[PDB]
Amino acid sequence: GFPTELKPGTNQFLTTDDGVSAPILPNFHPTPCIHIPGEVRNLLELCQVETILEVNNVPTNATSLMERLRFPVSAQAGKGELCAVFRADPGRSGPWQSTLLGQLCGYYTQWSGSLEVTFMFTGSFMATGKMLIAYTPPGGPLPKDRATAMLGTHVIWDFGLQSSVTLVIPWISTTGLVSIWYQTNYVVPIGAPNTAYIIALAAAQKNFTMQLCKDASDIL
Amino acid sequence: GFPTELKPGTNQFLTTDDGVSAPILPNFHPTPCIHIPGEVRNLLELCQVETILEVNNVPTNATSLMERLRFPVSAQAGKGELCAVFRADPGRSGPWQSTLLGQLCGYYTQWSGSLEVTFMFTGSFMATGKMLIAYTPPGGPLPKDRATAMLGTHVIWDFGLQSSVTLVIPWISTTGLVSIWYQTNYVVPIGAPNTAYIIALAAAQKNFTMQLCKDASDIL
Amino acid sequence: FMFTGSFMATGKMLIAYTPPGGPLPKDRATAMLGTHVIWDFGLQSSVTLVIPWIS
Amino acid sequence: LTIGNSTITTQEAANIIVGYGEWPSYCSVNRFYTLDTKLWEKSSKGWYWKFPDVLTETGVFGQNAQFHYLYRSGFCIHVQCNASKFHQGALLVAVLPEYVIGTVAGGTGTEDSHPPYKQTQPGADGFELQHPYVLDAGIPISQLTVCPHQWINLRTNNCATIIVPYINALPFDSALNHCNFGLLVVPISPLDYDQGATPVIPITITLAPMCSEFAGLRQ
Amino acid sequence: SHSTAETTLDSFFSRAGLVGEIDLPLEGTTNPNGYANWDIDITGYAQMRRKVELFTYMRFDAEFTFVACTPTGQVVPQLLQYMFVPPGAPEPDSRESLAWQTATNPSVFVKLSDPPAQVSVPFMSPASAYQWFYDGYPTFGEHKQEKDLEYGACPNNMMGTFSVRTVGTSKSKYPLVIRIYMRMKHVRAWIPRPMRNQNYLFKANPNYAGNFIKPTGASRTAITT
Amino acid sequence: VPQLLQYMFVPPGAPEPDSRESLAWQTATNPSVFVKLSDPPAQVSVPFMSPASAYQWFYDGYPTFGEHKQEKDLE
């Protein structure tokens, strides 16, 4: 009635709208809110939790899934390469779609920040040896041996420390590569198991975040 | 619902409207704005930059465009007329559609203000001579010789100065004419080139501005 | 170094010094990597070179 | 700063020109680079250069700059053109940011595949413009002066300088991945001289960046 | 001047004009599947394209509108759909595709009897500002020898995609003709670039042809007035 | 009846349409509005477009503002 004509496009219906509707029950009183020990604020803190990562993917049998998530180590192999973790890109298929970080990033398009990983060793109390962690920046060719990787940012493993070995990637945004190499041969005392299995952990840093949502779904 | 009836013409759709629409993504956060050394404010400062002007347009061959933008000078011609720049009207075809000032004014209908031009000379260090710059106001007949043009506002060229010669038009709004004449013969020392080429520059003054936009396009 | 050209002449010149041990110079680019002196004809004889050490 | 016996004769009376009245910035040195002399001829039409990819072969620190990824420096570009007092000519020097090289698609069919490596690599010497009116890119030569430039006249000066900071497409910039800029030199008035005189005009360009960065990544 | 509002860069870019033209005839071969798609090609029209190369680095938003009409211009009781496709999201492939019901893709239900509705999209470019010229390789991948699937649609430059569909299992009864208009609210540029003046050869690639014309040839000789 | 009609203001500099399929219809610089006639009539306004300070219904001189006073000028 009051003189004012709204510009055309009054009844457009887009999902993003910040519209409020009249309640179907204008007299109901909602149940009181309680305090629960659990609490969630954003997706950032959920990315700040640690979760396991997988390397080996050779066997596919149903009763054989466990030896996928861990990779073996033997004393016979020396001065070479044990395992080469696939390219660093959590959104795409590879290592990171198994962990929580990649899957939640699966609901997003692009991301930027820094990533860090920590490594845990499961050898005997009487065992000793030396290990190498190799990181190469994107763009650079494939590593050849321990010497070429040692030129760049590398982490050397000491068995005087149990799991203090950790790596931090300054920036991630075509993709970087990380690998593991034998700095020295594996030596074991007599009367001890001749082989062990290795596991690793991963998480997200403070400055890691996503920007835009993606409509991605696979199953079902 | 509230009693008020908008006057007829509520859903008229005109392009000039200052309307704001609901974003298609009500939750996205735009990328942060950065500081860039380049910066643009209006069309006036872009008109305040210098750009070359063209006079000669005799040859049309593809490998012959360069001698268009400059005009030659020879010692044989004397006490006469070397070059007569076309009528002063940047919007229309002629001299000024080659430079930036006229082309941007091409997107506009009418303009008012003052214009200035500067001249540069490319002779040898051992050369000398005298030159004349002629401007006639609109309405007045065509100039006949150096004497008739000298009655009006004229600029005399001195070769003791390299490019200090400049001209300022008090007002432009059917069109004015400017020409170049030989005040004296061209004298050159022996052992030096017998001819030279001349170039000029143009720009817009502070008080030059346009008023109304025009829907003008030619190619493609 | 002193130059004895005409008053109307101009050009560019290069002075090359290589340290002992290093191979023979190939062109102006290789010598330019080391300590070199560039000659300007805006100066008459201001061009000079100093060897830090000789043994 | 001499490589053995590299002590050239340099000018001390350069004409100082500032760019936008703004000095370069910090993270977001005394080596003077030397290039091969250029010969200017009566029928010459002008040249062009592409940085930093072609720059990584002439400089002493430029040769190492092939392996350096990022840059942090200020550019003091010196262009020198020595000539006699009775020579005639005119030269233009300017910098065109984000200068995309225009490929030429001739023949009866107006369609070509990905740009050939022959066109992408003109060498460290430089290349000549096929049709310098359009800069071989369909861009009119009349409009270069809107960008930073300098006028070189034989009767007026023999040298010029240009100072430009780093302007890139992204706040985080890569020098070995993204082509930054290039230099354009084109004659406006063809050079003339008397019969029997020297027909070759030397051109030299000197620049002095500060430093670059290695970067590097691992898997 | 004192009243310089009409002379600013916003006013120099303040105009809604023709951007897209897509037709959906009742029967034919242009779209025998009942739907169509449109890529945002501002460079397609030389009118609006020639404006942008005056600068190299620029930022702009946009708003979009839709008009449905018959070849005679009558109004019919049917609905049409419009949705913005981000680069990550997949384009529809069939009329009964599962992409129509995807929740993460924003879509709106609109009745064309209602006078035309208009929607806007904010800054979607991951970079700080748009770059109409990328002095390098079109693909951002690590391979520089193959025909990658990401060629043409690079994440650093593309700004979205639209699709159109008439929803409903019952068959559509009317022909459709659709016209698209766009306009910008905020425009900001940093560095000027010399204006592109000579004739164009390709639709989105600045490559040119060997037949040279000059922008002007009206003036015969210097002596001639 | 269910149809739409177009209205646009033509400034003196802009060219008038010449055909039904003319390119002037899609010109961006010419303001035009899409209107449904079923909607009760819409109204638009134009502000002061005269380059001069005020209108003059009588021009004591020549109808043309050109420098020629003998021909049949297009203006």
Numbering used by the authors:
A (entry chain C), B (entry chain C): 1 to 173, 177 to 223
C (entry chain C): 119 to 173
D (entry chain B): 7 to 34, 45 to 235
E (entry chain A): 72 to 296
F (entry chain A): 147 to 221
List passages from the publication reporting this PDB structure.
Enteroviruses particles are composed of single-strand RNA (virion RNA) genomes encapsulated by an icosahedral capsid of ~30 nm in diameter. In this study, we genetically perturb this equilibrium in a non-enveloped virus, enterovirus A71 to determine its structural basis. We isolate a single-point mutation variant with increased particle thermotolerance and decreased efficiency of cell entry. Using cryo-electron microscopy and molecular dynamics simulations, we determine that the thermostable native particles have acquired an expanded conformation that results in a significant increase in protein dynamics.
The population of K162E particles containing Coulomb potential, which correspond to viral RNA, at the center of the particle (A-particles) was heterogeneous in nature and composed of at least three distinct structures. The three states (A1, A2, A3) were resolved by 3D class averaging and refinement steps. The proportions of A1, A2, and A3 in the heat-inactivated preparation were 67.4%, 19.4%, and 7.9%, respectively. These structures were resolved at 3.1, 7.4, and 5.9 Å resolution for A1, A2, and A3, respectively. Interestingly, while the most abundant state A1 contained both VP4 and the pocket factor, A2 had lost the pocket factor but retained VP4, and A3 no longer contained pocket factor or VP4. A trajectory of irreversible molecule loss was resolved from the presence of either none, one, or both molecules. These data suggest that the pocket factor must be dislodged prior to VP4 loss, and both molecules must be released prior to complete genome uncoating. We observed a couple of intermediates that suggest that the first step in particle conversion is the release of the pocket factor (A1 particle to A2 particle), followed by large rearrangement of the N-terminus of VP1 and release of VP4 (A2 particle to A3 particle). Finally, virus RNA is expelled generating empty particles (A3 particle to empty particle).
